């Protein structure tokens, strides 16, 4: 199993601490404390954006269109320090990058 990550609840400015994590066998987790802890998306009613994106992922097997990887955002002159993502890529979030599950908190490879 491989993993990938995308930002959640990003609008403008500096990036936040929320992420959705999804595997190649479509396990899906979320963290709202910048990878400290993870909780399995175990859906229910599609009320919030974690729920929204997880149900998109399960249905289409890809991130919604509002996502670009980090190298794509940089290609457009993204500077995280500045927090100018909404500048060079309006309405976009970072997402889709390989996630190495380095602390081993999510189900192993």
């Amino acid at each position: 199993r491989t993993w990938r990550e995308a930002d959640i609840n990003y609008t403008s400015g500096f990036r936040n601490s929320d992420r959705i994590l999804y595997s190649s066998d479509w396990l899906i987790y979320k963290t709202t404390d910048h990878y400290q802890t993870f909780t399995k998306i175990r859906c229910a009613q599609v009320i919030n954006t974690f729920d929204g994106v997880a149900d998109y992922l399960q249905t289409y097997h890809k991130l919604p269109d509002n996502y670009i990887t980090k190298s794509e955002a940089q290609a457009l002159g993204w500077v995280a320090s500045k927090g100018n993502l909404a500048d060079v890529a309006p309405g976009k979030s970072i997402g889709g990058d390989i996630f190495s599950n380095r602390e081993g908190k999510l189900p192993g490879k």
Binding site: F14, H34, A80, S81, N101, R102
Partner: protein
């Protein structure tokens, strides 16, 4: 040219190392102080070039439960991906 200095003998724990990094790399306040967080910041926050001076690197390995190495590996991996990182192990 960002300078980050780790005084290895000062480290009291893995968490203390992340806090030193949060300071030296000027990471956001919500920095998760873990390897996944660190990778996120290296590829999605820190400006380059970066010089990471890690003094008494060898002492820091024991002062962390062998966690210093995995922190080092993340810097190495960012460097391998094309981040302009100079790593000094002293």
């Amino acid at each position: 040219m960002k300078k980050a200095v780790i005084n290895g003998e000062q480290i009291r724990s893995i968490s203390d190392l992340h806090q030193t990094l949060k300071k030296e790399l000027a990471l956001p306040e919500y920095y998760g102080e873990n390897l996944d967080a660190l990778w996120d910041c290296l590829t999605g926050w820190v400006e380059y070039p970066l010089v990471l001076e890690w003094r008494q690197f060898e002492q820091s390995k024991q002062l962390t439960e062998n966690g210093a190495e995995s922190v080092l590996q993340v810097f190495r991996e960012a460097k391998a991906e094309g981040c302009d990182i100079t790593i000094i192990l002293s």
